[PDB]
């Protein structure tokens, strides 16, 4: 075993690997959304950039799990990064609904990891999860829900003017 390893479950090590993959998967989904909104026949650039920035932050979160793995004396084991579920994302509302789901799926996996860490008696891991993942997740989920509520208020999917306005007012101008 690694000379650094202490109080670090095989089970925890494997779960960190799975989480690293899920973050890469989430990043790739968001990249796809970026590319969709950047199409000439979609053309909602602030929306596009929102998703591009989400992609980057999920990739950074993946990197943090690689660093964590090594700090604990586990071994990073990579798997294929699955392509996103969809090739095209419909409109801002559908994309945000998919993002909410994705964030919930990522959160569930993080909470699952936290439960394992709790059962395993792994306090450093629990703290890591709380500090670096769980709060920022809650905020993300809140933000996306807020957005969904606004998109519905604006009359999506039918109301194109409403969609236009969301891109100008709700998301940062890029």
Q: What is the CA radius of gyration of the chain?
A: 18
Tell whether residue 116 is a contact of a copy of itself (CB under 8 A): no
**Residues 128 to 167 in contact with a copy of itself, rule: CB under 8 A:** 128-131, 134-135, 138-139, 141-142, 145-150, 152-155, 159-165
By the rule CB under 5 A, 86 interacts with Cl ion: yes
Cβ pair 98, 85 in contact under 8 A: yes
Q: Which of 111, 116, 120, 157 binds a copy of itself (CB under 8 A)?
A: 111
Q: With CB under 8 A as the rule, give the number of residues binding a copy of itself.
A: 82
Stretch (H or E) spanning 68: helix 45-72
Do 129 and 137 form a contact (C-beta atoms < 8 A)? Answer: no
Question: In degrees, to the nearest 5, what angle opens at C-alpha 98 toward C-alphas 94 and 101?
Answer: 140
Q: Which is nearer to Cl ion, 26 or 154 (CB)?
A: 26
**Which residues carry a binding-site annotation for Fe cation?**
23, 58, 61, 103, 137, 140
């Amino acid at each position: 075993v690694s000379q650094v390893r202490q109080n670090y479950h095989s089970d925890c090590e494997a779960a960190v690997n799975r989480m690293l993959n899920l973050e890469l998967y989430a990043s790739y989904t968001y990249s796809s959304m970026y590319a969709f909104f950047d199409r000439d026949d979609v053309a909602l650039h602030n929306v596009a950039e929102f998703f591009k920035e989400h992609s980057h932050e999920e990739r950074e979160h993946a990197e943090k799990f690689m660093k964590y793995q090594n700090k604990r004396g586990g071994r990073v084991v990579l798997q294929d990064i699955k392509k996103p579920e969809r090739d095209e994302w419909g409109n801002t509302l559908e994309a945000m609904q998919a993002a909410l789901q994705l964030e919930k799926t990522v959160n569930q996996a993080l909470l699952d990891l936290h439960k394992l860490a709790t059962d395993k008696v792994r306090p450093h891991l629990c703290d890591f999860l709380e500090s670096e993942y769980l709060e920022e997740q809650v905020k993300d989920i809140k933000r996306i829900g807020d957005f969904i509520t606004n998109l519905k208020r604006l009359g999506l999917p039918e109301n194109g003017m409403g969609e236009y306005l969301f891109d100008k007012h709700s998301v940062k101008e890029s």
